[PDB]
């Protein structure tokens, strides 16, 4: 019986009153429009935005911590090299803004050097992520933003084919160029590759040897969140699949890295966590289309100027419920990203990794995406600050969370009544 229910469960009586009232429903749909704009149109005050940013920064941070310690080498087909040095610019190396892949004879692979093929894949994603982070990420609703990315590497050494026509696509190795396009998203990204040779004796060549320099210029690169998450995924999965050998230089006093030698996929907790965050932010960003597809801004009421009938006049309810559920799902995943990495709830070696390295910077606050000679062995990706801002944004989403729960309950009541 129903009266006997609406004693003990008193707020349910209120919910039914609200569901029969077209002005309460319209009020709830208005709220939903406003909470959507906070989630997908804002940056600082959007828990969703902060959680995406956090997931990207953790991937970039992971590499800023460990990249300098990571063997790479060989030639272009993942083959061992007898004498190849391949240097990638704007990368967080030991006391340097480059990373050098100069490990010879050893075959590239698991618990060995990272091949240059994988390194190029890694590097490109890193250069993009750092360029976007530097410009600042757009709010979630924007996906026609693009960014322009430029990066260089060099090849020296007898027999080193990592900058050859075959590796590169470039007509002629001295002075030549090549332009290719592809489609990240349903977007056209234009890539311009150019190659220059600098002889050993050439004037102004400090390094006493001769080398090929490759410049890649990418235009129209998507900076949307779906697109940047796909980059961080590539970054973290390249590392985890190639699983290369690393060994760290340990500082006196300092914070202490264990293990000191090993393989990079051996940080299983750290990599699982980051993969999880990326996955959870990808699902979070997916809720954006659900929200857009179910706009809540047309007012509702009884047709033929006759009282509203929640049993027949409520076919909008399915849509309202999908929208509210999406907004709620976004907020829960945002929170969940935060909890995956937050050191308050971490333990043992993983906690040290995060508090002593990943949530740290040794640059000397320099803006996001900058690589200096002191970036190595620290995250330099604003991880502590991003955690704090996520929590702040969630604290300031108190009211909206309650309004979303209410709209969802109203719609869910109406979906029930129509059956």
């Amino acid at each position, epitope marked *: 019986n129903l009266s006997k229910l609406l004693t003990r469960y008193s*707020t349910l009586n*209120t*919910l039914i009153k*609200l569901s029969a009232d077209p002005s309460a429903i319209n009020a709830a749909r208005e709220n939903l429009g406003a909470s959507a704009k906070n989630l997908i149109g804002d940056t600082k005050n959007s828990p969703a935005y902060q959680a995406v940013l956090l997931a990207i920064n953790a991937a970039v941070g992971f590499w800023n911590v460990l990249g300098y310690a990571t063997q790479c080498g060989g030639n272009a087909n993942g083959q061992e090299s007898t004498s190849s040095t391949t240097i990638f610019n704007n990368e967080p190396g030991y006391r340097s803004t480059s990373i050098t892949c100069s490990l010879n004879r050893y075959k590239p692979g698991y618990y060995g050097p990272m091949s240059i093929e994988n390194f190029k894949k890694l590097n490109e994603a890193y250069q993009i992520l750092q360029t976007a982070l530097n410009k600042g990420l757009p709010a979630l609703k924007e996906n026609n933003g693009t960014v322009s990315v430029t990066y260089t590497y060099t090849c020296s050494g007898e027999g080193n084919d990592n900058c050859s026509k075959k590796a590169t696509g470039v007509s002629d190795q001295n002075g030549g160029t090549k332009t290719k396009t592809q489609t990240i998203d349903g977007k056209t990204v234009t890539t311009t590759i150019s190659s220059k040779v600098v002889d050993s004796q050439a004037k102004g060549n400090t390094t006493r040897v001769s080398y090929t320099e490759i410049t890649n210029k990418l235009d129209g690169v998507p900076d949307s969140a779906q697109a940047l998450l796909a980059q961080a995924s590539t970054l973290i999965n390249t590392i985890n699949t190639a699983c290369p050998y690393f060994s760290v230089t340990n500082k006196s006093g300092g914070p202490q890295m264990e293990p000191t030698r090993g393989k990079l996929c051996g940080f299983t907790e750290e990599i699982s966590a980051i993969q999880k965050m990326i996955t959870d932010a990808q699902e979070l960003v997916n809720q954006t289309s659900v929200i857009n597809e179910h706009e809540q801004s047309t007012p509702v009421g009884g047709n033929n100027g006759k009282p509203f009938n929640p049993f027949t006049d409520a076919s909008f309810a399915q849509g309202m419920l999908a929208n509210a559920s999406a907004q*709620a799902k976004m*907020l*829960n995943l945002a*929170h969940q990203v935060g*909890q995956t990495i*937050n050191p*308050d*709830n971490l333990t043992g070696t993983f906690k040290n990794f995060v508090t002593g390295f990943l949530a740290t910077c040794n640059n000397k606050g320099s803006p996001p995406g900058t690589v200096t000679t002191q970036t190595f062995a620290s995250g330099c990706a604003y991880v502590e600050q991003t955690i*704090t801002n996520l*929590n*702040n944004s*969630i*604290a*300031h*989403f*108190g*009211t909206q*969370e*309650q309004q979303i*729960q*209410q709209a969802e309950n109203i719609a869910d009541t109406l979906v029930n009544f129509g059956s």
Partner: nanobody
Amino acid sequence: VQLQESGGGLVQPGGSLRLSCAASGSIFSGNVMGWYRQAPGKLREWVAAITPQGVPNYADSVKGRFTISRDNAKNMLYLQMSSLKPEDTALYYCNRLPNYRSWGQGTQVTVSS
């Protein structure tokens, strides 16, 4: 996965009250925590929140009168209420933000002359 509010009672307008919430570690540790209330004939309303680092914020209806705080050593959450009004009469509840989907029993506060 437990939330136990306490401290409520019947008071007079102008009065004050200190609400308490023992929360389990799961819920509490490293999470934003907050207070909610649910008044006669209305749905549950957000009231205050506080980050792990102790930064508090408030609904406009209680700003300047209620103070939220947290004790990280003991997973406790407090709400000091001042200058109570009849309009503050409600069941008060703590939870994390975003909400854990099972609520505690809540603690009744009645402000009345």
